Design a binder for this molecule. Structure first.
Ligand SMILES: O=C(O)c1ccccc1O
Ligand SMILES: O=C(O)c1ccccc1O
Lengths: 97, 91
């Protein structure tokens, strides 16, 4: 995997983009492992959506986006979506267990 | 970070989830560098069309719902295409 400035054409660019997208998928898959592990440390079902934790999480991700040359609303939006889905998945996991 | 099974409480879980979320942001930041580098070689229709099912498959292989993951990548790919177009027009 070449650095962007050493990419010689679109084959190199795409190999690197494929690797980075797969890394993101694999990281989301590991993230689910952690979210499911959380379910045993939840006092109750009402504990799941942990609103102070989520409330703080999104602006922190918006800050990381700004520190990584990305538009904050785009990245904060993506994480709102991921967090929503993972909460729903945790609630599903907690209910079926 | 501890593995999920070795996490002892929500402190451990959160530390690991924050480090993973930071990893994803950092990776998206690197991804932009590649999309901007590509500009000199735009919506590349056949490329997008093939990429999405590939990401759906990776999702299935990592125990995530494919529609949710494919939907995220559809959004990511649209945003980056626009940013590549912006970069190409601005330069
Ligand atoms: O996905 C998360 O990071 C999350 C945050 C707070 C509560 C439940 C969750 O799944
Ligand atoms: O983000 C992408 O993966 C992409 C793919 C094809 C063309 C332009 C792009 O930004």
């Amino acid at each position: 995997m070449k650095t962007p400035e050493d990419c010689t054409g679109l084959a190199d660019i795409r190999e690197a983009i494929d690797r980075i997208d797969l890394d993101i998928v694999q990281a989301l898959g590991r993230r689910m492992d952690y979210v499911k592990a959380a379910s045993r440390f939840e006092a109750s079902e009402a504990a799941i959506p942990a609103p102070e934790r989520v409330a703080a999480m999104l602006p922190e991700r918006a800050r990381w986006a700004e520190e990584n040359g990305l538009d904050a609303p785009f990245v904060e939006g993506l994480f709102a979506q991921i967090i929503h889905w993972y909460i729903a998945e945790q609630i599903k996991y907690w209910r079926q267990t």
